[PDB]
Swiss-Prot record, chains A, B:
It comes from Semliki forest virus. This is Spike glycoprotein E1. The lineage of its organism: Viruses, Riboviria, Orthornavirae, Kitrinoviricota, Alsuviricetes. Residues 1-415 are extracellular. It comes from the Viruses. The record marks 325, 327, 335, 337-338, 345, 347 as: Interaction with host receptor VLDLR. It is a single-pass type I membrane protein. Stearoylated. Changing residue 44 to F: E1 fusion is less cholesterol and sphingolipid dependent. Changing residue 115 to K: In strain: A7. The E1-DIII domain binds the host receptor VLDLR. Class II viral fusion protein. Fusion activity is inactive as long as E1 is bound to E2 in mature virion. After virus attachment to target cell via host VLDLR or LRP8/APOER2 and endocytosis, acidification of the endosome induces dissociation of E1/E2 heterodimer and concomitant trimerization of the E1 subunits. This E1 trimer is fusion active, and promotes release of viral nucleocapsid in cytoplasm after endosome and viral membrane fusion. Efficient fusion requires the presence of cholesterol and sphingolipid in the target membrane.
Curated annotation (Swiss-Prot), chain C:
The chain crosses the membrane at residues 52-72. Residues 78-98 are annotated as: Transient transmembrane before p62-6K protein processing. It is found in: Virion membrane; Host cell membrane. Plays a role in viral attachment to target host cell, by binding to the cell receptor. Synthesized as a p62 precursor which is processed by furin at the cell membrane just before virion budding, giving rise to E2-E1 heterodimer. The p62-E1 heterodimer is stable, whereas E2-E1 is unstable and dissociate at low pH. p62 is processed at the last step, presumably to avoid E1 fusion activation before its final export to cell surface. It is a single-pass type I membrane protein. It comes from the Viruses. A lipid is attached at residues 68, 78, 98-99 (S-palmitoyl cysteine). It comes from Semliki forest virus (SFV). Processing of the precursor of protein E3/E2 into E2 and E3 results in a heterodimer of the spike glycoproteins E2 and E1. Spike at virion surface are constituted of three E2-E1 heterodimers. Interacts with 6K protein. Interacts with host MXRA8; this interaction mediates virus entry. This is Envelope glycoprotein E2.
Amino acid sequence: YEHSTVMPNVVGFPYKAHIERPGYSPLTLQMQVVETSLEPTLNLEYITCEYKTVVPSPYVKCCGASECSTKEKPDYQCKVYTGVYPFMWGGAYCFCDSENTQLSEAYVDRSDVCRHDHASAYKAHTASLKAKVRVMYGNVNQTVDVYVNGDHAVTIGGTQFIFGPLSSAWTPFDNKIVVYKDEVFNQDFPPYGSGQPGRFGDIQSRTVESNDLYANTALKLARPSPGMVHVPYTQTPSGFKYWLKEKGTALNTKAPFGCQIKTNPVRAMNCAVGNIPVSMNLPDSAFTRIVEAPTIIDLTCTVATCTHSSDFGGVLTLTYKTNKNGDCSVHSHSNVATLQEATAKVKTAGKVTLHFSTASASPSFVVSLCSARATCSASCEPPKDHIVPYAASHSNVVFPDMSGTALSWVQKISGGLGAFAIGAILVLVVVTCIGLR
Amino acid sequence: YEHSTVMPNVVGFPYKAHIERPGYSPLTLQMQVVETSLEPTLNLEYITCEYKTVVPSPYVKCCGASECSTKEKPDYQCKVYTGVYPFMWGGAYCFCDSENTQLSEAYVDRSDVCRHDHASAYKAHTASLKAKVRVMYGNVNQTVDVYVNGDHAVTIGGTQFIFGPLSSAWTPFDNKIVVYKDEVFNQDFPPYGSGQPGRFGDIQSRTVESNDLYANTALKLARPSPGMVHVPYTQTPSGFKYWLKEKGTALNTKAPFGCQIKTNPVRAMNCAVGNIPVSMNLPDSAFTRIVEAPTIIDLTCTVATCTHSSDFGGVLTLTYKTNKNGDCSVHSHSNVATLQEATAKVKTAGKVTLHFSTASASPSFVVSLCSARATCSASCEPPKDHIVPYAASHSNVVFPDMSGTALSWVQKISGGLGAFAIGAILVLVVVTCIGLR
Amino acid sequence: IPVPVDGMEYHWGNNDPVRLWSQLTTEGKPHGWPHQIVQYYYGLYPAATVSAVVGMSLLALISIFASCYMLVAARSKCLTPYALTPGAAVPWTLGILCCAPRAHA
């Protein structure tokens, strides 16, 4: 039996589908989500890690002429000097006073260790949902991992479920993201091969193991001071390190909708956004024959007390009259209130209690006990805490229903004004009639 | 020095960017594509290869009663009969006359060899350009591989090029494709677990090495004919084989825009669609000082002959007056013409010859020798071959320009009628005038 | 096989594919007499050429009709006052400059 319904994509919301197949007792199937991983597809644009400046020992070919021997290493700089007098310990480095050259050379390379300390710069475009869902109908008390796209078809002890595409496609990850260790920053990294010295990605590698190492870092050499053998260079410090200090707020601390962020298989979890359409197929065995399903007559509501708190702050007692005992489904058709129980026991005595949470001062809903109905009402009260450590257990519907105390006053004044207006128009039309004919 | 331009994504089109840096001699930077792989992302929905029907030898527990021992092999079918009389050569098969059973069983399995024959059923969604570009400004004559997505910044001897996102996102691959050996069909394969016998996907392996094998094939046994020990079965022939015979026209022979298709890294190459924006940053060393570049004065066109053929069928000679000898850029600012030479050699004699292709009977394009300008014109003729073996070397601009013979005649006719209309207007105005005052 | 300006690619047998291209080679005459220049363009986008030529011809005819319609209206306004009571036209001394001399006179 095909049934299509939509659940709010909110973790820990005890949703209760109420299927009513003709010829069988109404069946309530309670189910809720427990975690919704949202993995976005990734492409590794490039990997950045702190550079390491290699400076081979200067080659001083004194009273000769060393020439600038160019290379192709990352940001390789080769500078040849003249008229230098190295002063190695213990006296002059060689006989000749002048006409001596130092072949200074330096170049950049990936840090000796950044297989452990790199910062990926993925580029994520497409999302892909994945949710763990708990379903309890009859007695299965089962949980299953599913892909919310409308294709994966899970089966839970008979009944087969297919969760449709998410109502929305909002994704917290921007087009470009950066993943360092445990955070996913919404940076806008420079295009590969165009990093600037000092900012992010001054040193860019195509992949952690590959060796291209575009290393624009403004490495500039300088003339060694007289009487020494240094190889001075004025390089702009690590661009990656300055990124660490100026990283800014990560996405883990500003993801909308309380989207918890995990890193290794980069994903956003528990994103309370949109609704999940679900299609279910049920074998007849899951249902109950009407004849053996206890019937109910003289159904009524009696709300002992209702406090529209975040939790189940409302208790209502249903007075009924049945033919036998047993158990069967109970549901509230309207969403202004949500019931804690899903199936209630029916005894000979016509008294069944239920707990309902609500968010309206004067709620009303059609309670469906087993098979009958009862238009329900309540004069709910507000709680006084201002703060609670548990999520909301009631759809945030506040617009009261007709016949409530607030609107009953509105209707009273509206009716009085309407009667006054109706009186005025009746006299006016009467005067018009007698004035015409 | 930033400079942003757009090139046509046509293989072998000698595009010629012309950068005018004030305070420097203008530099013509010619560049052309040589191959544009268009690789989309894939998701291996499943694998289909010709099935094989395993039929274990019947277990005739005659002189007794065998029971149907059910299994769970792909499309497993076990059948048990009664009152059968095998005749295994040399006489009856057991001392009974009747009361014998044959336990026929048969099931489907992937072919012995389909690691070499499987036909993938990928599901490609997103594209990813990748192009090889050859650029020769001044003297570099270099070729580079680049990702055309606006994020790859290739450096070519100084200058930095970034090939922005492709103007058009058109992709020859539909949402669902099929790759057999060397062709990529745009089939619409059934989703996993829903194939039908005879057609594509009768036997669907989730992966070449994985073992699930949903092989719905309507395997059906039949009662063995008396007096023999065969195991009859009626199975719909290989659904994969039927697809091979009736595959139809592959995408390799109907891809739009002449897109050649390669399979292994499934991709469409040489797709001549859209425009590739190019942003280039250059070092001032590449440019040339004005004080050093030769100066040009009194520039004027003269087209010896223009035949708007596919190749460079138009020759124009520029007469000028310089102060020294050297080389510098030439470029046609308008698009109705495309020069073959990029940098022309300027000599003391005021005569330099150039070749240009076009597609307009009366093109008008202001060439730019070195640093000066000269409006240009020609009375082009059409060629007579009807067929050529090389691609067009001119942007397909056919609309003529005013002052052309075709436009001059309509200008002549339009002006005469306008003067006639104006004269009538003046005559009427005077007539109404003298009537009023 | 058709070979439009974009080009075509045939793959006879196992031989490697070959690509051709068709040039703009219409019949008729290039720059020259209009009755020969529309022919040169007729062949390049025949539908566009015929659509343009009729559009030009119709607009030209409308302009000519408007001018003639304007001229006759001027004659009507100019000749009505002179010929209401009297027969007089200043016999072509002032019958020309102002309006149509075509009065019988």
